[PDB]
Curated annotation (Swiss-Prot), chains A, E:
This is V-type ATP synthase alpha chain. Belongs to the ATPase alpha/beta chains family. The gene is atpA. It comes from Thermus thermophilus (strain ATCC 27634 / DSM 579 / HB8). It comes from the Bacteria. The chain holds residues 387 to 578 of 578 of the full protein. Signal peptide: none annotated. Produces ATP from ADP in the presence of a proton gradient across the membrane. The V-type alpha chain is a catalytic subunit.
Curated annotation (Swiss-Prot), chain B:
GO terms for molecular function: ATP binding; proton-transporting ATP synthase activity, rotational mechanism; proton-transporting ATPase activity, rotational mechanism. Pfam families: ATP-synt_F. Keywords: ATP synthesis, Hydrogen ion transport, Ion transport, Transport. GO terms for biological process: proton motive force-driven plasma membrane ATP synthesis. SUPFAM superfamilies: AtpF-like. Disulfide bonds: none annotated. It comes from Thermus thermophilus (strain ATCC 27634 / DSM 579 / HB8). This is V-type ATP synthase subunit F. Belongs to the V-ATPase F subunit family. The gene is atpF.
From Swiss-Prot, chain C:
This is V-type ATP synthase subunit D. Gene3D superfamilies: 1.10.287.3240. The keyword Ion transport applies. One of its GO terms (biological process) is proton motive force-driven plasma membrane ATP synthesis. It comes from Thermus thermophilus (strain ATCC 27634 / DSM 579 / HB8).
Swiss-Prot record, chain F:
Belongs to the ATPase alpha/beta chains family. Produces ATP from ADP in the presence of a proton gradient across the membrane. The V-type beta chain is a regulatory subunit. The chain holds residues 320 to 472 of 478 of the full protein. It comes from Thermus thermophilus (strain ATCC 27634 / DSM 579 / HB8). This is V-type ATP synthase beta chain. Signal peptide: none annotated. It comes from the Bacteria.
Length: 192, 104, 206, 155, 192, 153, 151
């Protein structure tokens, strides 16, 4: 009736189903489409489906998926601090985490069903975008260890390259991802 | 106003019109701070960090009922010439009052 | 508490007011922190200015006791009395009063201002400015402490609410709802019994 | 009580609701319709170009957001004070007051859609350009700026 | 039964009567009579009776009544915050709203049926008391705008006259009310 | 539970009720009678001039007002703390505590109506003259001022 | 809801209860058993000499005391803050965290009774020898001191 999950119908359903996808109008108000809340959603099919992933999509897809999940969790666990204080006030590591959470949300979770190409994505496209994001994260963490200011990372040209991976075609994607990985390894070498 | 520090600067503070007393150790400094605080009078006391970094944390047991006196950690004489991290002072102060120690 | 429908509605209204109060307290805290993070800037600017003022005053005083006899300087200092020129007024800050040292600073109240040593008299102005800086740093620091305690109090209230009050009212609401459902079930059972009674009467003895 | 069977079932079957507020009624406002808990589920399909004006959806969204902000500031100012509020917050306060006084409280007058949208733009003119985050630039340019004197003369 | 207003009898009555005089246990416990819950009470004959009030009571009686309704609703709104944080946490204008609310509760809505005077109140007497209260509220609000301390307004002697007006005899009332209006103007005019 | 059918119907039938309080019982007060939920319908027919004493009714009304204020201020302290209480609020709290300890609590003792009125007056003297809005000025002149020490100690 | 008829009637019939906690699950702890509200009514008669070993009951009671004290201190930190905690409070909070991380979080290990007791003794050794009020001095002497070197 009013979104309360305590009712018998929803409780009986959740007892017997495997995946719960929590649509939320909050995400829609934020223009995050599809509007699925990754904190309350859950799937009981990942462990049994892992072997299929290792055999078909990539031997490391489970690892990248779990890493993305953990990174989103860390972005969520910093909410109290960003609630009490603004976003800029956070130290380098936390600010990197927030920006990477933003890029994850906007360029991997988001999908536009009215787009000619983005309406559909294969598991290899997802593996590619996730690998791009995680490689960028590792390089950025190293760079901030080296002492580069977060502003430089915020304006790195690899951001445009990784943000447009959604709008690229299925057949063209492999070369694009190879080039993006090369350019991710390169773009940090030039920076001090 | 009253200040407790080394004898050499106590005469200078007296010249400034304040009250100065020679201090050279933590125990005597704490005892003199207790005497000054229990002695009703001026509302400010300046304490060097070299002898008592946190005077309030040491003598909080008295002024709770009468918070008129003011404790301010003043930079030490030796540290004054060679300097000290002022940014660190406010950083640690935020760490104390909020507990998040986040800034830049 | 009395399980009744009106009591349930009152409890739900209380829950709504509590959620609204949590939002209100959060917004007040946001205002407090917005002020605190600027008042810290003011405090640090005052602290650096005071550091510079103290450095220059100490530099000025250092040579006074070298060229001239220290004993004469001490006597001249003793000539100057320890007058009072500080007015500890109260300033209203976020609904609280704090001691503001709006010192009148009477320059003409210094008895025997003239000092026999040539440079001692000039050094007095430097220490007057240093004392003004010390007063300023104290004034900013006290208000910073006050705002810190206000933010801590507000967060204590918010956490108390969201961790003790709201769950308690939720438990009360669930209890009352359960009792009302039980009463409804008993009423349905009774109605079934009596309807069966009349039906059996008609069927058997008409 | 919205949890009652009659309104809950009616909500299941029907599409939205127009909610009357007792606070507005006691404050003297007629018709006392509180926009915040009101919803029209079909509004989108019946609004827009070729039916009404082009700026209707965005004006409704901006009115909703601004009124919500204003009520929030109104609650907070009772404890922090008018001076404590920033300037944009004060703008929201005045906007909410004017919205209740001139938009919601129309008495028995028959307002055409054009007159209502004119009042809406007059109310939105109080907020600065750039705070109208939910209206396209062209619409703001074309319709922003009109003073409240257009309707204040003959409310 | 139990004081519950959700009984079928009370609900059936709600849907047929033009006025609902809801009584309260909290007020009666405090020996505050008539003990009518203002928030949960209503009438439906107010609009239709405006001409009669204009002719037979005062040409501005409707507006004074609506002003008191406005003030009581403002009090009801502020009482949420009062419970949250307490009376001292409010600003001065809100404190004035609260105080005028108490003045209306005790000096206008309260009424003693065992008294030889207050047991009955005429329409013009009610109008006079309401006018006194509204004039005082306007004066005090202005004073707060000019900076007078709220604590100093509550000690103005005129408040005792406003509170004792109930017990004035019907015949004597007009003189008392003219004097009270004069005194209300004076009590702030002298301060300037 | 006062909402239970038995007390509810009885109260709808009878002419008042004296309701005990478990909170006062735990504090040791006897008779543990809470006056706010209690009531006597026919009271006005047996009190006043020529029956008990002229100040009776107004004294009872004022006692109810003050005790209700005290209970409300207790609830306020439960959420804000004593430090924020103004002087009048503390006077009302002290009145509530003294009320519970010296008017409600009497043990096994026969108090004449005159003694009871005297105690009520000594207690109401804890409050400023002007707050007694329910008691006529003449009664205040004739009975206000006596202190509680004059009765005990 | 522990007051639901199913858990309630089961508790009235059974001889204890093992309870899982959502906090330990949100912390990523397996198995997420919360020791404090759990209980085994028959435990006293199935541990000790000739059944496990002689330190079992005292160690269990001491672990209960230490973890409950740590949780009480943890909820005491929601008032005065970390800076106000004393040395004993720091030790107890650290023990509670390490307890959660090692004694409860065991994944799919098939810990033996001896292994579990060794882990418990290592975790207890963080606290001072004098605070182990519930363990006989002999057992403290025999098994105290081992660090968390096994990881």
């Amino acid at each position: 009736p009013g979104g309360d999950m305590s009712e018998p119908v929803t409780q009986s359903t959740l007892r017997i189903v495997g995946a719960f996808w929590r649509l939320d109008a909050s995400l829609a108000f934020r223009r995050h489409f599809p509007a699925i809340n990754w904190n309350g959603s859950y799937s009981l099919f990942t462990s049994a489906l892992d072997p299929w992933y290792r055999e078909n999509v990539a031997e490391d897809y489970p690892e990248l998926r779990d890493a993305i999940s953990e990174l989103l969790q860390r972005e969520a666990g910093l909410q109290e601090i960003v609630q009490l204080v603004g976003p800029d006030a956070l130290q380098d590591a936390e600010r990197l985490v927030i920006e990477v959470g933003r890029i994850i949300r906007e360029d991997f979770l988001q999908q536009n069903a009215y787009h000619e190409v983005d309406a559909y994505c294969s598991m290899k496209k997802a593996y590619g975008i996730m690998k791009m994001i995680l490689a960028f994260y590792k390089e950025a963490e190293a760079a901030i260890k080296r002492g580069v200011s977060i502003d430089e990372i915020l304006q790195l040209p690899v951001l445009e390259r990784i943000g447009r991976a959604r709008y690229v075609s299925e057949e063209e994607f492999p070369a694009y991802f190879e080039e993006a990985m090369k350019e991710i390894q390169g773009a940090f070498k030039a920076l001090a | 106003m009253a200040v407790i520090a080394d004898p050499e600067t106590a005469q200078g503070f007296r010249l400034a019109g304040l009250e100065g007393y020679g201090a050279s150790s933590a125990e005597e400094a704490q005892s003199l701070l207790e005497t000054l605080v229990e002695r009703g009078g001026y509302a400010l006391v300046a304490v060097d960090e070299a002898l008592l970094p946190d005077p309030e944390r040491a003598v909080e047991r008295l002024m709770r009922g009468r918070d008129l006196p003011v404790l301010l950690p003043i930079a030490g004489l030796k540290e004054a010439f060679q300097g000290h991290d002022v940014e660190g002072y406010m950083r640690e102060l935020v760490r104390k009052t909020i507990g998040f120690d986040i800034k830049l | 508490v009395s399980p009744t429908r009106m009591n349930l509605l009152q409890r739900r209204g209380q829950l709504r007011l509590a959620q609204k109060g949590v939002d209100l307290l959060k917004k007040k805290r946001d205002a407090l922190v917005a002020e605190f993070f600027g008042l810290v800037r003011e405090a640090m600017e005052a602290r650096k200015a005071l550091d510079q003022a103290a450095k220059e005053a100490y530099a000025a005083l250092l040579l006074a006791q070298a060229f001239d006899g220290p004993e004469v300087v001490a006597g001249a200092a003793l000539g100057v009395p320890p007058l009072e020129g500080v007015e500890a007024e109260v300033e209203n800050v976020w609904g609280s009063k704090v001691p503001r040292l709006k010192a009148t600073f009477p320059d003409g109240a210094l008895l025997s201002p003239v000092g026999t040593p040539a440079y001692t008299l000039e050094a007095s102005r430097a220490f007057r400015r240093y004392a003004e800086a010390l007063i300023r740093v104290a004034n900013t620091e006290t208000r910073l402490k006050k705002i810190g305690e206000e933010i801590k109090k507000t967060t204590r209230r918010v956490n108390a609410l969201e961790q003790v009050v709201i769950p308690g009212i939720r438990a009360q609401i669930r209890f009352i709802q359960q009792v009302l459902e039980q009463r409804e079930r008993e009423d349905t059972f009774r109605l079934k019994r009596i309807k069966g009674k009349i039906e059996a009467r008609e069927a058997e003895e008409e | 009580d919205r949890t009652h069977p009659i309104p809950d079932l009616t909500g299941y079957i029907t599409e939205g609701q127009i909610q009357l507020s007792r606070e507005l009624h006691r404050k003297g406002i007629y018709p006392p319709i509180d926009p915040l808990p009101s919803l029209s589920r079909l509004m989108n399909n019946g609004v827009g170009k070729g039916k009404t004006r082009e700026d209707h959806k965005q004006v409704s969204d901006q009115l909703y957001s601004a009124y919500a902000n204003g009520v929030d500031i109104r609650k907070l100012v009772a404890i922090i004070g008018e001076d404590a509020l920033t300037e944009n917050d004060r703008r929201y306060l005045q906007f909410a007051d004017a919205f209740e006084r001139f938009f919601i409280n129309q008495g028995q007058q028959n307002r055409s859609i054009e007159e209502s949208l004119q009042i809406a733009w007059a109310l939105l003119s109080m907020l600065p350009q750039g705070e109208l985050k939910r209206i396209s630039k062209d619409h703001i340019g074309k319709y922003y700026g009109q003073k409240l004197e257009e309707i204040w003369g003959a409310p």
